Amino acid sequence: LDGPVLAMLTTAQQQQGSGDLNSAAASLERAQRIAPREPQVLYRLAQVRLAQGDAAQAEQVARRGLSYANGRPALQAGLWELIAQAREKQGDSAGAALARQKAKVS
């Protein structure tokens, strides 16, 4: 396992788990300096932003992670569900259903 990326993920999850979504986001942006193309980093980053209520932001991060998630179906399913939840919180139930449709058949 790649230690540096995993260290930042681990640190991010400890911070999110503690209620410090700001630092978690900072830790995940530091993770990108090591792994700018890691969809799992983007997945967690989109989660933290979504948990902060920054839905439109989360959606674009998750949509970016998706472009790097090719041939990783469990992860693409996860990212689409995140995108659905981000559309929902933006008042968009059509784009949310269409996203959950892509999560179910990827």
Residue numbers in the entry: 154 to 259
Publication excerpt:
In the major clinical pathogen Pseudomonas aeruginosa, PBP1B is anchored within the cytoplasmic membrane but regulated by a bespoke outer membrane-localized lipoprotein known as LpoP. Here, we report the structure of LpoP, showing an extended N-terminal, flexible tether followed by a well-ordered C-terminal tandem-tetratricopeptide repeat domain. LpoP is a predicted lipoprotein of 259 amino acids with a clear lipobox signal sequence that promotes localization and attachment to the P. aeruginosa outer membrane via an N-terminal lipid modification at Cys19 (Greene et al., 2018).
Crystals of P. aeruginosa LpoP143-259 displayed monoclinic P21 symmetry with unit cell dimensions of a = 48.8 Å, b = 154.6 Å, c = 54.1 Å, and β = 90.1°, and diffracted with a resolution of 2.2 Å. The resulting maps showed well-resolved electron density for most of the protein chain, allowing near complete tracing of the ordered part from residues 152 onward (see the STAR Methods). The structure indicated a monomeric form of the protein with no obvious crystallographic formation of larger oligomers. LpoP143-259 is made up of six α helices (H1–H6) of variable length that form helix-turn-helix motifs similar to those of TPRs and that are linked together through short loops (Cortajarena et al., 2004, Zeytuni and Zarivach, 2012). Numerous inter-helical hydrophobic contacts favored by the high percentage of Leu (12%) and Ala (22%) stabilize the core structure. LpoP has a striking structural similarity to protein domains formed by repetition of TPR domains (prosite PS50293 family). LpoP's C-terminal globular domain exclusively consists of three repeated TPR motifs, giving it primarily alpha-helical character and a structure greatly similar to the N-terminal domain of CpoB. The maximal chemical shift perturbations were mapped on the LpoP structure and found to concentrate mainly in the region connecting the extremities of helix 2 and helix 3.
